[PDB]
Amino acid sequence: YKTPPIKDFGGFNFSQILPDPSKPSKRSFIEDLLFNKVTLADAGFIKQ
Amino acid sequence: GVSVITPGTNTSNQVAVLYQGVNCTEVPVAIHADQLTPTWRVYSTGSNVFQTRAGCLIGAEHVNNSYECDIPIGAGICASYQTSQ
Ligand SMILES: *[C@@H]1O[C@H](CO)[C@@H](O[C@@H]2O[C@H](CO)[C@@H](O[C@@H]3O[C@H](CO)[C@@H](O)[C@H](O)[C@@H]3O)[C@H](O)[C@H]2NC(C)=O)[C@H](O)[C@H]1NC(C)=O
Ligand SMILES: *[C@@H]1O[C@H](CO)[C@@H](O[C@@H]2O[C@H](CO)[C@@H](O[C@@H]3O[C@H](CO)[C@@H](O)[C@H](O)[C@@H]3O)[C@H](O)[C@H]2NC(C)=O)[C@H](O)[C@H]1NC(C)=O
Ligand SMILES: *[C@@H]1O[C@H](CO)[C@@H](O[C@@H]2O[C@H](CO)[C@@H](O[C@@H]3O[C@H](CO)[C@@H](O)[C@H](O)[C@@H]3O)[C@H](O)[C@H]2NC(C)=O)[C@H](O)[C@H]1NC(C)=O
Numbered sequence: 001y002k003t004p005p006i007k008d009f010g011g012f013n014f015s016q017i018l019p020d021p022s023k024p025s026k027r028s029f030i031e032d033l034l035f036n037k038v039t040l041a042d043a044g045f046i047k048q
Numbered sequence: 049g050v051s052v053i054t055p056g057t058n059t060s061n062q063v064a065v066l067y068q069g070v071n072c073t074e075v076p077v078a079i080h081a082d083q084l085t086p087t088w089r090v091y092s093t094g095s096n097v098f099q100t101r102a103g104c105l106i107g108a109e110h111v112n113n114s115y116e117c118d119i120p121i122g123a124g125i126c127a128s129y130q131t132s133q
């Protein structure tokens with residue numbers, strides 16, 4: 001389900017919790033904070 | 049590790065292999081010139097070698113469509129058996 005472009009939610013606000021396209025990782029603002037807060041190790045990237 | 053992808057014994061004998069966590073340059077170096085743990089090398093010729101995040105996928109034609117997962121592979125990749133077949 002795709003959120004409608006118009007954010008007419010009767011004054012309620014969700015911009016921070018909704019995804020922002022500008023982010024290369026389509027993550028909500030709060031999600032980005034969670035990612036940074038966790039000191040992840042062994043990400044499992046392909047590397048080379 | 050080396051894992052084998054199959055759609056069923058008799059649905060087809062065609063199968064694909066995955067070198068999880070490997071680069072798609074050593075499996076070519078794993079050609080019959082040097083005998084690694086795998087003995088078969090006919091598919092080591094490639095002609096359809098595909099590199100993905102999970103590892104090196106060989107023998108499986110790479111498409112650019114989207115469908116529900118058929119057989120899990122990893123890192124956002126699932127393979128199926130569709131059409132030609
Ligand atoms: C939610 O409330 C506000 C007012 O309508 C709007 O969301 C707000 O968007 C700004 C982004 O501009 C957030 O911070 C601001 O950033 C700018 C730079 O872009 C900065 O110059 C400002 O000083 C400010 O810090 C702001 O935190 C954010 N607030 C909230 C509650 O999300 C948005 O219009 C409203 N969204 C909805 C669905 O009503
Ligand atoms: C798997 O093996 C191949 C080849 O061994 C690797 O290909 C290499 O990829 C890097 C870039 O990702 C190439 O380095 C490049 O060098 C130029 C200058 O020559 C630089 O301007 C670029 O920014 C980049 O750093 C490299 O030439 C290329 N070949 C080799 C032998 O390294 C590949 O990276 C390995 N991993 C994967 C996922 O393919
Ligand atoms: C699935 O579709 C995408 C396109 O949305 C394929 O990516 C690339 O698409 C272009 C145009 O069809 C292919 O043509 C080539 O484009 C390059 C761009 O650098 C150009 O230099 C060449 O002269 C040629 O016109 C391109 O080969 C194709 N593949 C790339 C860029 O890697 C994608 O290949 C398709 N996936 C498949 C067939 O598995």
Ligand SMILES: *[C@@H]1O[C@H](CO)[C@@H](O)[C@H](O)[C@H]1NC(C)=O
Nearest residue numbers: 054055056057058059060061
């Ligand atoms: C052999 O073919 C039938 C097709 O209905 C099915 O049982 C399956 O594809 C095969 N049997 C197996 C894998 O045990």
